[PDB]
Amino acid sequence: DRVLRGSRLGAVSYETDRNHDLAPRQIARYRTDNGEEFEVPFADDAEIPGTWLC
Amino acid sequence: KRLKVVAAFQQSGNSPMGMVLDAVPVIPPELRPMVQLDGGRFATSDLNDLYRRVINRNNRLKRLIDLGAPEIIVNNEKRMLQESVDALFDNGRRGRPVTGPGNRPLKSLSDLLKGKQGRFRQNLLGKRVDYSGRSVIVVGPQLKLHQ
Amino acid sequence: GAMLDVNFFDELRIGLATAEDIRQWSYGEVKKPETINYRTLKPEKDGLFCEKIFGPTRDWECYCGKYKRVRFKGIICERCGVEVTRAKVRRERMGHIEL
Amino acid sequence: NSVPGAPNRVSFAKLREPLEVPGLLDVQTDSFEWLIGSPRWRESAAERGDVNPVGGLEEVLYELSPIEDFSGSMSLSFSDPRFDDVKAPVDECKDKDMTYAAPLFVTAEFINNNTGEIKSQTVFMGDFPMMTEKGTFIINGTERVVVSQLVRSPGVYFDETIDKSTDKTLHSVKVIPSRGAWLEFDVDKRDTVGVRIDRKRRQPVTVLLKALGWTSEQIVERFGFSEIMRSTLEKDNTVGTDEALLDIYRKLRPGEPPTKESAQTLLENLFFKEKRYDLARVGRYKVNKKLGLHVGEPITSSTLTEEDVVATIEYLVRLHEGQTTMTVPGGVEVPVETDDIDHFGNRRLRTVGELIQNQIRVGMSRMERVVRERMTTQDVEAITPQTLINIRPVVAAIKEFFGTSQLSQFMDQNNPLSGLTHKRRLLALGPGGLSRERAGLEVRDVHPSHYGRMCPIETPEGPNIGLIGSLSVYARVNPFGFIETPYRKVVDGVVSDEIVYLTADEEDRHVVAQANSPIDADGRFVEPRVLVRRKAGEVEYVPSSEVDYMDVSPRQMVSVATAMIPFLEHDDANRALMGANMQRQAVPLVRSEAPLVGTGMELRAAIDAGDVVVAEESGVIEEVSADYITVMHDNGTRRTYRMRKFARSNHGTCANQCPIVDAGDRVEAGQVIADGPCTDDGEMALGKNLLVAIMPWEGHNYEDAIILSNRLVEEDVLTSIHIEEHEIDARDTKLGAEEITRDIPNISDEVLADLDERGIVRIGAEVRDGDILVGKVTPKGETELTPEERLLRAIFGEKAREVRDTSLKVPHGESGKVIGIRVFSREDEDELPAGVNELVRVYVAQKRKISDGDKLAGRHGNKGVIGKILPVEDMPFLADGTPVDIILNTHGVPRRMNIGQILETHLGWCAHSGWKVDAAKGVPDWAARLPDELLEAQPNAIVSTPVFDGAQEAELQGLLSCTLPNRDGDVLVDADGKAMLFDGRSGEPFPYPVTVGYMYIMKLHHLVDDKIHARSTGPYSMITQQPLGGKAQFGGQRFGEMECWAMQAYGAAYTLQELLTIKSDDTVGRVKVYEAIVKGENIPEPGIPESFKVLLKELQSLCLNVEVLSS
Amino acid sequence: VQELFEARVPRGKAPIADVTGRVRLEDGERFYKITIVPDDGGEEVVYDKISKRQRLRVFKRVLSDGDHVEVGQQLMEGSADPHEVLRVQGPR
Amino acid sequence: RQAITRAMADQARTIRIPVHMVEVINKLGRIQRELLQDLGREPTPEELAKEMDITPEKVLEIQQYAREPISLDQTIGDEGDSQLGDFIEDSEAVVAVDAVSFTLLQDQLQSVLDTLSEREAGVVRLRFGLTDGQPRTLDEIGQVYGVTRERIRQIESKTMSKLRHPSRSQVLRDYL
Amino acid sequence: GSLIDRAEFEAENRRVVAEGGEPAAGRPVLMGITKASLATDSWLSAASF
Ligand SMILES: [Zn+2]
């Protein structure tokens, strides 16, 4: 009956991919129990949690 | 016949410990979408059912080993997990195909490449093209040959 | 080699992938069978569509809405956990399942 | 005449067939009335075989009743199906999209065994769909026809095989049950017989007889003559009956202990416990006929039996022994021969009653499983038949048969003929029927047991040749599903009138002669050596005494749609096939003139197709209209026959019904009262009669192309009406509900002039492609805005306008008026689906005139598109100044082998100008065989040459010499059939006379506006990013593999790169191409297609590390 | 064509000669059986299950017993398997 | 029995529905089924709402929620050669004329802004966020322009008066 | 008992008749075309066949 118009649950907004200035961000080096290190780029004004699901 | 595969393993730096498998990868979700139709009639691309089966049985097995269970239940669970991963990589290969509703065999990962319906002959080689068109022809006996 | 595949290739080396290769490929261990929340119609946490693993459903939008601009690119919301970036990465980010 | 309001169509028939053409929808109607068990069926079942008049539901319930538990301590048994009235009439259901139903009621009775009670209730079994008057079903408003299916009857199928490694015959036997278990007794490469039960291994048959407890002495006494059975008797290596039983159990089961009684009951269970093995009544009758196991005892006990098994094995060993006959102890003897699986004794017809009975029975299976799951569990002396019975699997089973099965087809109608031949159609592919992937080409082939029982001409022409056939004109279905055929028996040269219907085996018993044979109307074949048909298909000149059956008529072998072809006996079978197919694809025009030259099968095929309103009882017309005929019956009562004005058919055509009777005429019981879509004064009329010329005109009629006059466009000769439906709904959402309203965001006012105050357009508005039909807006939500859009909204003061327009626009290439708008509302208390507020349908209709590209065809498979519609001036005209209408091609006639169109053309000119054969110097020679009242005929008088009692080319030659002049003394067409055609273009006469004449041609349903298509940029697919497919969407043409090989074979690499990257899948490249084309820049370099990345992610997900490398 | 390009052994496989010299034409028990006489000589190759449902090769007349043949002349009538004629008469 | 039912409600459907909603869905289905037996008619949702002591909007929400998703790979065509996935228009994709339309709109808007002066075009671009996507407000604009926010409001009022002229509006009205 | 290309069968022999000459010997075969095109060098062609 319908026209078969699909849409995934997502929004598309086309801005320009600008790379000259961004928000400044720190880097948190999380470490798991089995000696594994991972890095999460968090912003400056951002509370870094002690643990993280990597 | 055995020296074929054994020398092929010896030649390369392939380790043969990859025929057993420990971490099953997940195909990204835009390739197995749950698209909302006009009216909320959702449409899953049928890999999500096999992935849900594998996720279910693996979590139940992990719970069972955490619980401490007799050998029969754990072995039955691990056989169920093994058959689930078999269904995921090639449904209908080993014995009974995992059916869907209405007795439809679930399109596993290998069935996206096999047959005429596979990605190769249906979408990789021949593609639908834009700037196309189609009509019934009539004869043009005043045209020139390049027209 | 390539990750976004700009057109200069010579070989396509197939190879039997190991467990280290698969858990090095993926962006997170999916550990929940929940596909999409039944009411709000958004992908769940740690589910098969989870934005923490595969990326954001809306272009430059974290899940908790705290970051929404192009300027916040490549950073991760410290609450919702999603990297705020383009929504086409959900074509291209794989997950894995620790058996 | 045989029909009281028939136009007089003077026939060229020399014969006189006694059996008139039956009630052509009998194959639907009588089967469904058998399913109901209606009294009209019950009297015909009391006509013969009156001992067991049982309906379909009564049979299903009797094999269901009683139903007991695991203990047998409580039994529920049904009884007595019953029907109420229908819940709604036919046109009301067709309007409001309800299915045409009628409620079942079953008197269900529960008995308690231990204490003893009855529980007689009236269980509502479910709303049951019913066949209409005209043979069709109506499912959810759409009209559906369940098409009959051919399957092989369950029985014993003896056959021989050969081996190149042996060069000896290897016989076999396949006892096929319905829903039981197969078993075979195949002599191997050596001389050992072997039982294969349920496709197990070799397993010699003396072991199976010991599993029946038969001693080796009993085998020796039974098979003393049988050498191979003796060798397998000594070679069995297992004695002891239970010692063989454990062998059978171990081969069949393995994974189970012996537990001798469980093996003992299993062989009884697998073949003789009838809840797991049911060869049907057809099966028992066929088996008892095949082996002679029953003298006169009735068909009952539908499980197998040991007597049948031992007779099967004896029949197999005598078949390998080269025996010709065999008597069984306790039964009649039978011949010994193999069986063909294509013979129409071995291929029954599961018609619509059998199909719905099978679906009801498989519904009752799960219902009975639910009952016995429920009956044991719940408490006793509290249950009732209302408690135990869940009708939901039954009603779900019937609904999932009617909707969504490959047999319940969307009923194709774009003329009455396609409806008529879409019923009475034999199909050979379904559940349990042969699929195309397993289709053997032997089943494609006809063979001489189709004569009278099927039509070798009519079948689909694509890849489904020979699978889908059609019933004959005179065919009939036995109560077991075998296909009858009427024959006149002849007793000692006296051709009687005892028209005995015959099935295929009984046709093989006797010999059958042909109706076109010299008969003095006293029996008494003039020729002693008569053509005849033997059993295997042989044609011999048997002396005229052993002939015991004559055909009822000629054209008995042919279908309905092929019987309307004139001069059939001159065409090749390929082009007659194409004529019979493309006679089912005509569209109904707006004038619909009856054909000049026809056959006898137009009037009967129209009044049986149901698309002509027929006066039920005789009387005088009280009042005509365009909407109703109120008749006045002779005894007081009046009755209004409401019309059906401008209905849309299932393929989008006209369905008008103008009345043909006047305000004071008398009608008789059976008179045509209203010409339907493709009718004219009752008889069928699919096209128009057109003046034709057979010259090759200036290359425009090259390679089947047809040119036309402009007279057809100017005078609306070929003008179909096409009625298309559009619909949109208004359903709720998470953000509220969609709103059909006149106010549309971001829209102008000149497009909002068609709309009324509350959405939909006004009736009568002419719309174009891309116009608003239903103004319907949805709540969109709240998105962030781009800054350019934000400041433009700030500049022009327009608000955000938070609703998003997705209105119903009439799509591309569709136009025309708006006939009617039916709107259904949730507030008006209608039956909408859940969460949908307002459903509204819009019927746009146009008047498709003829054009170049439109497919045209005559009645002989001489199809072709329209090359060029010439103006009426530069078209070849006769000496009279009549311009011809179409111009065919010469080179299409001989090399296709259908000069049936040429004979039809000559006879068309004869029937058009009329004739008068001068019988003044006596009747001439050719006219003597010709019947009376055809020696003279008025101009434009219709005649009829039937299919095989045809026109006789000598008599047609004599006719064309003796036609009468037009208006002056002027004979346009000479004796050969060719006129002196002047040229319209230059003006000089053509230097040779050219065959002209009148021809019947139809407007086929392959018009251009349905077929044209183009897309620059439209939608795209979901997973891979390819463009879509089909005219419903935009879509692009499939640039498949063979196109790729052609582009490689040119060496054109760049064009192939464009076609495979930046027109389908290079997703940045598509918008870069569009931007560069519009801006006028160069076409940029293509990138990596998206489907390759999809393949790469699939291979990565299959635990194959697929890296990609530069160096 | 399809059984030729697939390089299957054909249905009507007529064996060919393997060396020059005469032959042992003999109708055995319901099928022919052929031994080849060399000219060097050496190992007389035998062909066993040549079916008498097949027909002998007619050439220039039918093949005589002890008729001198070539290195790779087709002996019966049918279709020579190209696996044989590659092995018999080299890759040329 | 409880663990089988709890696992069934948790792991049956694809879109997972919590157990109270599945309990009321099965209650609705049981009540509607019993009324289809006894009443002999599939009842109205308002009747089912009255029977389950709730509102018909709740009944329609539940009947909306019970619709399990369909398979994207089921054969759409009657001839078994096409799946449902081959007939879904991706509305989320780029319309591919809106992109070139938006780029041309950006060019025309940049031309029209370049008709203005430097302070005017700077104030407009910083007011609407053309340069960064984050539109700064009047006090920050006056801070980068050294002036009051009220002077900036005067300038913005003047430029919105200027832009509303048809001399600039004629080539921008057609972009909506 | 393996099928390798003649362009490789000769050139690899040149790599091995040097450095101590042992000639790898072989006969020409006539492989069928589905057997040929599936036993090809590039696996991406044969994967799509
Ligand atoms: Zn967030």
Side-chain angles (χ1 to χ4, degrees), chain B residues 25 31 39 89 109 112 119-134 136-139 141, chain D residues 700 866 1012-1013 1015-1016 1020 1023 1026-1027 1029 1036-1039 1041 1059-1060 1063-1065 1089 1091 1094 1098 1101:
Chain B
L31 313 165
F89 289 151
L109 278 178
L112 305 153
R119 282 277 187 275
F120 279 137
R121 324 168 59 205
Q122 185 113 34
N123 300 140
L124 260 308
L125 301 150
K127 304 180 175 166
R128 313 292 213 116
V129 287
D130 275 356
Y131 311 103
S132 144
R134 147 155 298 203
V136 43
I137 54 172
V138 296
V139 70
Chain D
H700 292 252
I866 283 138
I1012 212 180
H1013 202 36
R1015 163 212 180 123
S1016 92
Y1020 286 103
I1023 315 180
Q1026 304 216 355
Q1037 264 47 246
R1038 174 124 188 91
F1039 193 81
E1041 222 167 343
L1059 283 155
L1060 291 186
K1063 297 201 224 160
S1064 299
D1065 288 334
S1091 187
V1094 167
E1098 283 217 22
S1101 153

Side-chain angles (χ1 to χ4, degrees), chain D residues 792-1001:
Chain D
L792 262 67
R793 287 294 170 86
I795 278 172
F796 300 130
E798 265 219 358
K799 213 51 190 300
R801 302 299 310 274
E802 78 278 2
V803 277
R804 160 167 39 88
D805 157 71
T806 53
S807 160
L808 174 57
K809 305 170 159 50
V810 41
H812 45 275
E814 302 166 12
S815 50
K817 311 256 189 301
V818 175
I819 287 200
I821 292 187
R822 211 162 324 267
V823 50
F824 303 142
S825 152
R826 190 43 75 88
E827 248 311 297
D828 299 343
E829 210 191 12
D830 317 329
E831 285 309 305
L832 268 87
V836 185
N837 296 346
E838 204 149 347
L839 190 269
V840 49
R841 292 206 272 263
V842 169
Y843 301 112
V844 173
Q846 33 181 345
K847 209 172 177 182
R848 277 185 187 149
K849 278 184 183 181
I850 207 56
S851 156
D852 37 358
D854 292 316
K855 188 162 170 180
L856 253 61
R859 264 178 320 183
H860 307 261
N862 41 9
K863 39 157 169 178
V865 307
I866 283 138
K868 172 179 191 208
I869 302 183
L870 265 280
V872 87
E873 37 263 24
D874 45 354
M875 172 74 53
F877 52 95
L878 316 145
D880 203 16
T882 329
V884 314
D885 288 351
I886 88 171
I887 294 187
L888 285 182
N889 201 333
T890 298
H891 317 270
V893 170
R895 76 139 155 88
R896 272 163 218 264
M897 305 289 309
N898 44 349
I899 57 158
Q901 58 191 307
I902 307 300
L903 297 183
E904 177 202 10
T905 288
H906 290 303
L907 199 274
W909 181 259
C910 260
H912 161 66
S913 37
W915 64 91
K916 181 190 156 36
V917 162
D918 41 354
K921 318 218 284 182
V923 183
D925 179 75
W926 76 93
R929 189 56 50 86
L930 200 131
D932 215 315
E933 43 99 43
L934 268 153
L935 315 172
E936 36 90 27
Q938 291 328 106
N940 319 315
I942 39 178
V943 287
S944 92
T945 91
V947 158
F948 286 128
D949 192 3
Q952 304 286 346
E953 190 261 340
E955 306 164 353
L956 189 142
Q957 176 99 39
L959 263 189
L960 263 88
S961 35
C962 205
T963 176
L964 51 101
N966 37 4
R967 293 187 296 126
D968 323 336
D970 219 349
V971 195
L972 291 173
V973 171
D974 47 26
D976 297 347
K978 297 185 239 206
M980 198 46 70
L981 265 191
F982 282 1
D983 175 42
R985 176 149 282 175
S986 72
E988 324 266 328
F990 288 146
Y992 307 100
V994 156
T995 292
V996 306
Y998 251 102
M999 200 153 168
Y1000 199 66
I1001 36 176

